[PDB]
Design a protein around this ligand. Structure first.
Ligand code: HEM
Ligand code: HEM
Ligand SMILES: Cc1cc(N)nc(CCc2cc(F)cc(CC[C@@H]3CCCN3C)c2)c1
Ligand SMILES: Cc1cc(N)nc(CCc2cc(F)cc(CC[C@@H]3CCCN3C)c2)c1
Ligand SMILES: C[C@H](O)[C@H](O)[C@H]1CNc2nc(N)[nH]c(=O)c2N1
Ligand SMILES: C[C@H](O)[C@H](O)[C@H]1CNc2nc(N)[nH]c(=O)c2N1
Ligand SMILES: [Zn+2]
Lengths: 410, 414
């Protein structure tokens, strides 16, 4: 039945009806909540009710539920699953399904933008060279000389499971990481294993601190192939600080385009194992997690040193002070280079506004508090104080296994 | 439900295995279709038939902990409790069982980051209390013991259990020590805006308010279901800390201070199906409870603007992060002021590091540790603490602390 969510700062109460339409599991039970677990836990027979569900909500979104167009589409889809064990989405259904997978992404604070999404149909692709051409067009389009535009590129759906299209990179643009003889790590420590697979596949590493990784692209289940993104397509930002002139001497930079390439798009029971999507950054993604996680670039110690902070005891909050300055620098840098970025105060503001929109016009908004609240300054943002209900609506983005754990090579 | 559930720490790769969840008793509020993990709160009294298995379960657990399960004393205690429920519809805990039950309610409190301390809890048995004056004496003794001139000691005082629901003992205060808040005709608030409703109840009950920014509220104490009564805590028992900053000399000019003892007094303690509706317990603060929530919440003291002004910060763009910068300095001042005055406080880095060590020990020796990530992660600098990266399982073990309705909403006035 109906569920209420309260904001404890503004005392606004919203009423959720939309959760009655979910079916996929959350991972919780009545006795155990798994809200902080990151990853909890086809045939003709399973496929038709899923397709029927999706076709039903599409024709209901365009105000033609039960129409003649609706009926023939259900019939069309029915006979296609019969003869081929799958079916193909219309262009309009593809675009609607991709926008709603974003709209339904409970962990995304950026969803106020959900309906401004440029959808690139790449379902005619057959080879890794074709994938690379499609991916370059995406990157060029989404980057737009710093005026970033949300986009998704959708490669052919899964068939028998042995001819998957996959982007092996977890993101389209990432820096390499290198295991050093002495024990430490040059570059990004999260990408050490992927970097090794690229080297093992023939990539010549410059062994620097910000080496853009090549694309490793698998088409139709074949061995993946390496490709270099042309450098003029990779927009980067040197990180400097408005007051600390020594900050540029740290030599830090980052790329402007965040582009997730390892997730699975599910629409009406069809599985798109390669659907790279991109938006623009929230400042904390770079300044808190990328630079200050102990298992990432891990620069807090250096910054606090140049800040001459007393680092002998934790209760001086030297880590918290250094962390704010780093995030000031990131926002100042992207803004000075006219590269789209949002700070966590503005992003969480917009998300509360989005939530209000969705409850009014849709009857709810699935939202994952554990991911929505920013990784710094939590309670001075409005989402800290916002109760949220998490539930799984489809179309959706899902996690899938890494391809180097399942691919049987030549 | 499967026998083993795994949790991973994503910073360190450590994987832990939980079997304790199989003893889960009540409901989280979640279902397999919806998660309510960020919902703050997701007369009846227990009958004889509900009480028997709840008492057996607790007694069984107690005799297991002292390595006397199935023993003669175990079976005799079971037998004596069963008779008591039969004749009187209730039973009385032994002092040993009361102490065990209180410590385990803390140990089981999924929202508490301070639980590494759970076995060092001083339990004060106040079940012989009969009047509000006697409750005041017990609470004063609690405050003085727990404060200990600044070397704070965790403690709980347990008043008589519920009987028929018409004779409840209650502390109407939500915490033993809070500052008053006063709504002004022009809509502004003086003092702590969170406490305006309770403050008005006190004034109606006869309190003469000084109408200051930091006035300690009186105790409002209900014994045996009678109308509650007002008492002033002796001010020498209320340890307070003036807030100053190690670098900003102007920070003392803001006139901020805070009390040293966090003491929750509106929760209900449940042990073996018995309900202790008045059980004030106290610990010591984590700095962010004061520095981030009390001072910087918009609907609390809300000083970020005034601090940012004196820090000469650009306050027109949010992307200058002027709020974040000032929040850090306020939390530096709070930790510096408590440490300088030798009042126990713990920073959020140290407290979350201890909690990870504690949770690992509990997984190792107890088979799990219920934890509520939404509450355990501090309200600032979340991801630079080790709990941010820690997967957690949340579930309800008993003995437990529970929320209960506010007493002014249910009390039948004599
Ligand atoms: C347009 C600007 C966008 C912003 C500012 C934004 C912001 C964010 C942030 C901060 C996260 C948390 C990511 C993390 O901590 O690793 C996130 C997650 C996510 N975003 Fe958005 N996002 C944007 C666009 C998009 C788009 C275009 C899509 C898909 C079409 C999308 C789908 C998702 C999904 C599925 C997640 C969850 C990823 C996971 O579970 O690992 N986002 N977003
Ligand atoms: C000894 C040092 C202690 C520390 C550092 C500590 C720390 C904390 C913190 C930071 C919270 C979150 C509070 C909030 O955000 O409002 C909390 C909650 C809690 N603590 Fe502890 N605590 C301590 C002692 C205790 C003791 C002695 C008990 C009970 C015997 C206890 C039981 C609880 C409970 C039940 C909650 C949940 C309160 C609620 O849901 O509103 N804590 N603790
Ligand atoms: C569309 C979009 C917009 C945005 N603004 N942001 C994102 C996530 C960005 C991102 C960039 C990377 F280069 C790497 C990762 C992986 C992060 C991993 C996944 C789970 C744990 N860890 C956080 C995410 C996506
Ligand atoms: C034993 C103990 C130790 C500690 N270190 N801390 C606490 C919580 C302290 C506290 C002090 C207050 F003055 C008010 C509250 C209640 C705050 C309310 C409850 C729910 C929303 N809000 C946070 C708790 C308890
Ligand atoms: C909506 C959300 O559940 C609420 O703001 C919670 C979030 N986490 C919290 N965590 C702690 N420790 N204390 C709190 O009061 C809250 N408030
Ligand atoms: C254990 C926990 O689920 C994990 O650290 C989550 C917490 N919240 C997060 N929130 C965001 N936005 N991104 C993350 O990677 C995480 N990590
Ligand atoms: Zn849950």
């Amino acid at each position: 039945r109906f569920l209420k969510v309260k904001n404890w700062e503004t005392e606004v109460v919203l009423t959720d009806t939309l959760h009655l339409k979910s079916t996929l599991e959350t991972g919780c039970t009545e006795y155990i909540c798994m809200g902080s677990i990151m990853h909890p836990s086809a045939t003709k027979d399973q496929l038709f009710p899923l397709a029927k569900e999706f076709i039903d909500q599409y024709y209901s979104s365009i105000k033609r539920f039960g129409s003649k167009a609706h009926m023939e589409r259900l019939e069309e889809v029915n006979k296609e699953i019969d003869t081929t064990s799958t079916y193909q989405l219309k262009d309009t259904e593809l675009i609607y399904g991709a926008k709603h997978a974003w709209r339904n992404a409970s962990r995304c604070v950026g969803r106020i933008q959900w309906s401004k999404l440029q959808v690139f149909d790449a379902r005619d692709c057959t080879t890794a060279h074709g994938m690379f051409n499609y991916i370059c067009n995406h990157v060029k389009y989404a980057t737009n000389k710093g005026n970033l535009r949300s986009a998704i590129t959708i490669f052919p759906q899964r068939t028998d499971g042995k001819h998957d299209f996959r982007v092996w990179n977890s993101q389209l643009i990432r820096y390499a990481g290198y295991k050093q003889p002495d024990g430490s790590t040059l570059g990004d420590p999260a990408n050490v294993q992927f970097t090794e697979i690229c080297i093992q596949q023939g990539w010549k590493p410059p062994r620097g601190r910000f080496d853009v990784l090549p694309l490793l692209l698998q088409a139709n289940g074949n061995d993946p192939e390496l490709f270099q993104i042309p450098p003029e397509l990779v927009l980067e930002v040197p990180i400097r600080h408005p007051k600390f002139e020594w900050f540029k001497d740290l030599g830090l930079k980052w790329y402007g385009l965040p582009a997730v390439s390892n997730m699975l798009l599910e629409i009406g029971g069809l599985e798109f194992s390669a659907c790279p999507f991109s938006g623009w950054y929230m400042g904390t993604e770079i300044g808190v997690r990328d630079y200050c996680d102990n298992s990432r670039y891990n620069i807090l110690e250096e910054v606090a040193k140049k800040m001459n902070l007393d680092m002998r005891k934790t209760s001086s909050l030297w880590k918290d002070q250094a962390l704010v300055e780093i995030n000031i620098a990131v926002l100042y840098s992207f803004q000075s280079d006219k590269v789209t970025i949002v700070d966590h105060h503005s992003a969480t503001e917009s998300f509360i506004k989005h939530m209000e929109n969705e409850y009014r016009c849709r009857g709810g908004c699935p939202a994952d508090w554990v991911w929505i609240v920013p990784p710094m300054s939590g309670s001075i943002t409005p989402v800290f104080h916002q109760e949220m209900l998490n539930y799984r609506l489809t179309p959706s983005f899902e996690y899938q296994p890494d391809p180097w754990n399942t691919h049987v090579w030549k």
